[PDB]
Amino acid sequence: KLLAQEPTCPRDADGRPRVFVEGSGAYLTDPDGRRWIDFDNARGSVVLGHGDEEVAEAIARAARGRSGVGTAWSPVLDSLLGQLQEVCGGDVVGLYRTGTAALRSVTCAVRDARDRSIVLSSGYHGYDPMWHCDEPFTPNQHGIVEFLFDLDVLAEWLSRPEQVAAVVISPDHMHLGERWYTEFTRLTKEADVPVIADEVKVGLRYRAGLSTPLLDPAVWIVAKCLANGSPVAAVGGDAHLLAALEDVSFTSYFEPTAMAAATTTLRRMATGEPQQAIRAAGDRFIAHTRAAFANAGVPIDLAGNGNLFQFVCADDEVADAFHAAAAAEGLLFFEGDNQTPSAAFTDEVVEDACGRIDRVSAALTGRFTDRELTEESWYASAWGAMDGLADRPRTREETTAIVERLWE
Amino acid sequence: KLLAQEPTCPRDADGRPRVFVEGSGAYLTDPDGRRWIDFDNARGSVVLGHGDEEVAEAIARAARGRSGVGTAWSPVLDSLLGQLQEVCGGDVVGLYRTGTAALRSVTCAVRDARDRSIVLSSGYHGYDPMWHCDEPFTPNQHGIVEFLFDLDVLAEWLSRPEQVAAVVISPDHMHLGERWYTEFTRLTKEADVPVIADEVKVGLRYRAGLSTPLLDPAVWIVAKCLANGSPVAAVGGDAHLLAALEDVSFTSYFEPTAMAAATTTLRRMATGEPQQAIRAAGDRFIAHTRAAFANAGVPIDLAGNGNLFQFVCADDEVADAFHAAAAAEGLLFFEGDNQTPSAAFTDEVVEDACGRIDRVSAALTGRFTDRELTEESWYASAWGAMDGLADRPRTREETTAIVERLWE
């Protein structure tokens, strides 16, 4: 009753936040002592695992003042900035406390440097009201045009390239492939319009770097993979587009526990070793689950890979039944959105999770055999998880019909 | 070089950041092993002392997953929200990662609820470009009117109150007295315009509550005194003005180390005991330093009190020489701004700092004896530390002259 905000979090079927009292690695414990396997992982920001020991020891030393103070530049900051530039590229780098703050700051800075008013956007960029819009494909009151990853609309807006400050996208790799990224980059290069790659979710997710070499971002942002859940985001890119960042400073800039979390995690994510382990383990879970449902006649498929995947259900009634059965087995999925295992999702947790999925599959068998995964199923599922239109062959008239069906 | 941002931090006379390796209580150690006394304390957010052990134990346990996980609601959140409402009041509360994010979100929410576009503002509210303006006393492109704590200008804008959504001020108590606040509240009550009290700096600074009962804020924000430097800011107040906060959610919302720091610190700040201890110790330092300078003919005075004070120097050459001498003695002041001791500024540290000040005063003696603090000295110093005009008697035409002198 006291909270004015509505934070995104796991909720029961009555909409009440699920409470978890502790976590370790891949397991959460609820107030009754029941253990759940976490695939949500603070919306994909816990990539090493809850309570990771190396990060925990670094945070504890930082909390005791051993690794610098919030008052001043610390011996480890240069190494953080240098590694961010080595891994992600760019002339210059910047730090923020949320993805939302980073996205607003760089978008305003790029727009100011470009002295142009229109920003073409796809994907979620945070909670700030500058991104709110009543309708797609037209400018909101902040000059932002949502284009739902539709390249026909993008091409039309880029046909008047001089009024476009930038194109900002949150890259998705479950439903957008090589053809989409090749054409996206072709259009933006042709228009000579800088690209802001919002990689808050996919930067460092798949490898020690940004998510695809088919993008040539003028500015990038990463965050969820950077600090095992501690509140750090980073940006980098062309110096002149980020000139306005000279005005950015905030009180907790040098706070040592955030710095310990980001440096310790980035050093490990820069080895590529966590992403390779998660990919293998998550891929085994996906393969098992896809086969389990298909053999049981359960109309649920999967998209994505071990690092980041989603469930595709025939309809919302199947999805509701799936989520209720998953919760009953102690599987904690980010409902309707993307599942992101951490490095604590090891071979033994995979076996546990596969066993829980066997019980989920048994619980759904015979209930929805008549339902089919349709083109509509895939569009609706993708929309819920990557905030726009899947790259599936479609006509322009179908684009309109899908958007009218799925908007709001 | 790599950093696109310009974070506020202690810098040498060439503008290079000073590095500190570790800190404990009130003492910092530099790369050469020299011990410095911190009066900056992460811009006033370290109020218990660097590496406070009780906070460090709470942070370390949270870092091991023992006190909730970033994935989900945990009991510590319920306790923090209740503590905030108990100490600061209000219908509802919200949490943010910086003061800047809190001020932008609250201001946007209040403007939306009030369905009016003009916001009257004094004081610093964070780094967001919404606060930037070319000129005081006129609306910027976001509808914000800077009025530099001038009540004649405020009265002028409030004489046509229906266009005014809110008045947001960062209360200063070094240069604005009880009569300023009585008239401010009289004017805003008369206009029936809600007040947003940006208490990011002074909330809980002087006692276990907001900074003055002479203000009647519809919405408050606190942060620097909340979490001993960990990145937490809080807001609260009238539910209808904060309705838009339902749209606020961010990935690290449930991050456990931040909540551990905030609950542990707030528990102590709620007793009023740290603020009383700091007041006493800082007052002893102020008294010693005022006399040391005055008795040596050094034209530097102090304003404020033990919780929050500043140096008032005759001119910029005196200020530069003072800062260089202080650094040479290992005194770390927030240059040109406010000094905010922590609860680790105990009798022993007071004695050490007073001896260091004796050497600063010795280094300055005989260099500036012929100079005096003028009204210009006081306006210039106050402008640098509290971001507007001191409450000194002046005409409307004199307001114009001071502002023309001091506006960048």
Ligand SMILES: *Cc1c(COP(=O)(O)O)cnc(C)c1O
């Ligand atoms: C979550 C997310 C953001 C916002 O990050 P916060 O830290 O939650 O503000 C921005 N962009 C993308 C692509 C995201 O997934």
Ligand SMILES: *Cc1c(COP(=O)(O)O)cnc(C)c1O
């Ligand atoms: C420092 C400060 C802010 C901004 O807070 P950050 O956490 O630095 O963004 C806002 N208001 C006041 C009064 C401040 O002193």
Ligand SMILES: [Mg+2]
């Ligand atoms: Mg989503």
Ligand SMILES: [Mg+2]
């Ligand atoms: Mg200041």
